[PDB]
Design a protein around this ligand. Structure first.
Ligand SMILES: NC(=O)c1ccc[n+]([C@@H]2O[C@H](COP(=O)([O-])OP(=O)(O)OC[C@H]3O[C@@H](n4cnc5c(N)ncnc54)[C@H](OP(=O)(O)O)[C@@H]3O)[C@@H](O)[C@H]2O)c1
Ligand SMILES: NC(=O)c1ccc[n+]([C@@H]2O[C@H](COP(=O)([O-])OP(=O)(O)OC[C@H]3O[C@@H](n4cnc5c(N)ncnc54)[C@H](OP(=O)(O)O)[C@@H]3O)[C@@H](O)[C@H]2O)c1
Ligand SMILES: NC(=O)c1ccc[n+]([C@@H]2O[C@H](COP(=O)([O-])OP(=O)(O)OC[C@H]3O[C@@H](n4cnc5c(N)ncnc54)[C@H](OP(=O)(O)O)[C@@H]3O)[C@@H](O)[C@H]2O)c1
Ligand SMILES: NC(=O)c1ccc[n+]([C@@H]2O[C@H](COP(=O)([O-])OP(=O)(O)OC[C@H]3O[C@@H](n4cnc5c(N)ncnc54)[C@H](OP(=O)(O)O)[C@@H]3O)[C@@H](O)[C@H]2O)c1
Ligand code: NA
Ligand code: NA
Ligand code: NA
Ligand code: NA
Lengths: 249, 249, 249, 249
């Protein structure tokens, strides 16, 4: 069974309290992995424990991935308590509807526009550096999965998207340059960008979304479990997953 | 079991006589699908029948996918003999090492340079049109899988690549515009681009490739079976699969 | 004056009878270049001669760029009559509104769908090979300009676009691989992709286009003259030019 | 003369003390524009004044574009002293050679890896928001030019590039989403991404670069003056400029 090498290993999943990240934590735990689920608000993560049917576990830890200090505190706690990080899932992300500028009367705040870059692009850079330092310390070839977006690969028509696409284009380039760097030094850690179209979560992408095709969080988690299950010599660089009949925004 | 809806259905796989396409035909047949494997030379396809362990089958038919007449003859035979096409796998493709021009003393022939476009880009356009006409005639939402390349998404450094990358950039755009068109008319047929890095097959990509990481044909077929297995409401638009430590050419 | 090195040289411009190509021929001739304008119908090209104010000229020749034989006959006539090709402008192209398939009741003919690939992608491959063979025979570092499209860089939402975007994605990859090949062999011929948004020409992109921002043919020709004017050591790989306030289709 | 509408207007150019930005400031001033050149170290900007031959001017101001407070102080000084910002050139940027991780023994510091995102991506977001607020306050349709990179459009092979490509992919997406937003609200401000290959400046891209083709700073400034010169109804969305025979890293 391809998930056997992962039973009993440790996965860190950012954005674990809601949405895609909450579904990844349950599917990993059901596969026998010990998950450390992190978010700024941990109450909902604690509650996922009642859905674990398999032999893995879910542990909640508080962390704002935009803050280098908070990320270092979480990785130090993991190292002290669980040991090696075997899987890193950079799933936390935000989206604020409105404009870069006020030409449409919907400019987002400067705090929000900076936050979208810090969480969606800086967050995965900082977490990937801590995860890989743990993996290489432990002589272990693990797997980094970055939850990207179709908007990391095309420019949305909607003018509500501000710098969200910019952050995900950032993450496309980051993901590829990280895998490039590992490969150039003959290191066997895997990196995958998983890019969803619309998913029903707590992220409001379109307020008027009730009639639009939308994936479930489990559909995305299912795709993440497939890419972790692939053999140690096989990378899935990119897996773009969208609901059928989607019309991108 | 997610492959249950596919048992007993018909898949057409171009480039079935060798490489990735031969591995797709065996993995589909082992999953209970009746495969029609096509290539310009059918002897090796006939031989794959001895590897079928499951309840599906493999039938060889001769076809040059660059020829509209040959493609129409094969689709007419399928319609007359097996009925609806449920899965279409556009896997046939070629690569000729050398240049567009003679500036390096390795210009490829005009026949070869035209052939690479006709097989790798026209072939999937013609086969997808026949497959979708069959699916919609039969009121069936099937799945089109196009075997692309990492070189459909970046420009190779090697000057041996001529218009191969152009043909695969063509196929990236084709694949996305086809799924766009189906979605815009609320049609639920799925389309996937699967983009491999180096795979050990009969295609000579690099003559000096013995030390390079390379996927096996089964690794690619495994990824094709995963995308066909996904639920009817879930598209995998793109699945890029590469051997670990690959340094793209 | 940066256009001085070009006065008295020979430019070949495909699609010269209408639209962007007719405007390129007049702007080149006004700059002192001797233009050979080609299209399937030459009457309108003959008429551009009355607009030449400068010291260059415009000569009409009949050629269907999708046909290897017609392209070879035109290049042989040029070689026999004018000598070296110094500038090649691959501007001819077509667009047929409607679908790859009939799911929307607007499927384009198989002849048309094959023609779009043959003219828009094969045509520039064949012309570039003849132009570069002429340049290198003559020990001259000339300039290849390919008229691409914004749709060579993103997938249109409109389902009227069929394989047009595929052909222009093809041309993006072709253009880059050609410049890659020249550079890898230390050859100094320049290659530029010029990618327009909507331009008012004889190509019907949107039937309901009267209120949409649209470039004029001269705006595009102006950009082509800028890229030819750049110094021999400076490449403009890509110049994307769009009317202000455009909303891509 | 197409630069007439710009004589006497105000341009802000970040990264003015060296390299491409210093060359842009002199070429703009020679065209009659009043330039405000900004960088963290202003001494070299003061010195460019002796190269102004035309009727424009160069004024030095200190600003770290990664700091929202420093950017707001500079824009407030400009508003108080010169008035409307007519042209914004986001040219400041950094590159630190080495890795995201330490797998190759060349990991860059966490301060540096965060700085590359803050300067190269946050900087242009903050400056563009202040510039556009000034333009729209003044009812003026100006021009935003972002100095990107070929590495904002492909993933470098070199493992010395860390998150530099990520930052420039960020800037590609930012630039396009900004122009998207302006167009969607029928605003006529122009946005251009100018993407150079190697340029000889104070940025060390390759330590062993003496034999590589390299643009001069003036070549890039020349391309920036061309895109500002284009008519008010014509956008140059992207202008990629590279030295001839370049082999991208
Ligand atoms: N249609 C879609 O929903 C869609 C489409 C494609 C891609 N995505 C991507 O999917 C990923 C998951 O989002 P989702 O759709 O599941 O949205 P969601 O339901 O809002 O979940 C976002 C999760 O991230 C956490 N988070 C946000 N900022 C954080 C930070 N600074 N530090 C730590 N945790 C943080 C949130 O919890 P806290 O607020 O408590 O910290 C929450 O757990 C994101 O990267 C998103 O861009 C979503
Ligand atoms: N490293 C790699 O091998 C690699 C990497 C990424 C992508 N790919 C893609 O993988 C696909 C499969 O190629 P492969 O690597 O498995 O190579 P392969 O072993 O050479 O197989 C190519 C198959 O296509 C058939 N074929 C070629 N031209 C055809 C035509 N005109 N009509 C019908 N069949 C045709 C060949 O048989 P006949 O000659 O008998 O017709 C053979 O069955 C291609 O699209 C290729 O571009 C391969
Ligand atoms: N909005 C736009 O118009 C737009 C946008 C972006 C890109 N483009 C690109 O701009 C280029 C020029 O088109 P246009 O807009 O100027 O359209 P146009 O007015 O229709 O001109 C097309 C020209 O190409 C010629 N042509 C077509 N097929 C040919 C072939 N097989 N052999 C030789 N000549 C051929 C046509 O003449 P014959 O029919 O007599 O041969 C005509 O001279 C095309 O590559 C197009 O894709 C146009
Ligand atoms: N091969 C190349 O050189 C090349 C290739 C393509 C793209 N680019 C892009 O070209 C642009 C210009 O760089 P260059 O090559 O001319 O390099 P350069 O000679 O090092 O100039 C960089 C300029 O940016 C300023 N700067 C850096 N960080 C800043 C910050 N936080 N705040 C304000 N100013 C800042 C620097 O001055 P201070 O340190 O005093 O602040 C200097 O004036 C960059 O965006 C770069 O990515 C360069
Ligand atoms: Na991977
Ligand atoms: Na799909
Ligand atoms: Na060029
Ligand atoms: Na512009």
């Amino acid at each position: 069974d391809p998930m056997d090498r992962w039973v009993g290993k440790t996965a860190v999943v950012t954005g674990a309290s809601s949405g895609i990240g909450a579904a990844i934590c349950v599917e990993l735990a059901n596969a026998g992995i010990n998950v450390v689920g992190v978010a700024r608000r941990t109450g909902p993560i604690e509650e996922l424990k009642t859905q674990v049917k398999g032999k893995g576990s879910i542990t909640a830890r508080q962390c704002d991935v935009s803050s280098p200090e908070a990320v270092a505190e979480t990785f130090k706690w993991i190292d002290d308590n669980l040991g090696c990080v075997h899987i890193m899932v950079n799933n936390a992300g935000i989206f604020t509807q409105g404009g870069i500028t006020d030409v449409g009367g919907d400019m987002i705040s400067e705090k929000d526009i900076m936050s979208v870059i810090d969480i969606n692009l800086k967050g995965p850079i900082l977490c990937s550096r801590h995860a890989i330092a743990s993996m290489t310390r432990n002589k272990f070839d693990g797997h980094i999965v970055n939850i990207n977006s179709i908007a990391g690969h095309y420019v949305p028509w909607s003018s509500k998207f501000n710098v969200y696409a910019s952050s995900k284009y950032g993450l496309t380039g980051f993901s590829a340059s990280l895998l490039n760097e590992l490969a150039d030094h003959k290191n066997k850690i895997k990196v995958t960008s998983v890019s969803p179209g619309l998913v029903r979560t707590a992220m409001t992408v379109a307020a008027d979304d009730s009639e639009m095709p939308a994936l479930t969080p489990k559909d995305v988690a299912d795709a993440v479990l497939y890419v972790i299950s692939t053999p140690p010599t096989v990378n899935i660089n990119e897996l773009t997953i969208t609901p059928v009949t989607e019309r991108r925004l």
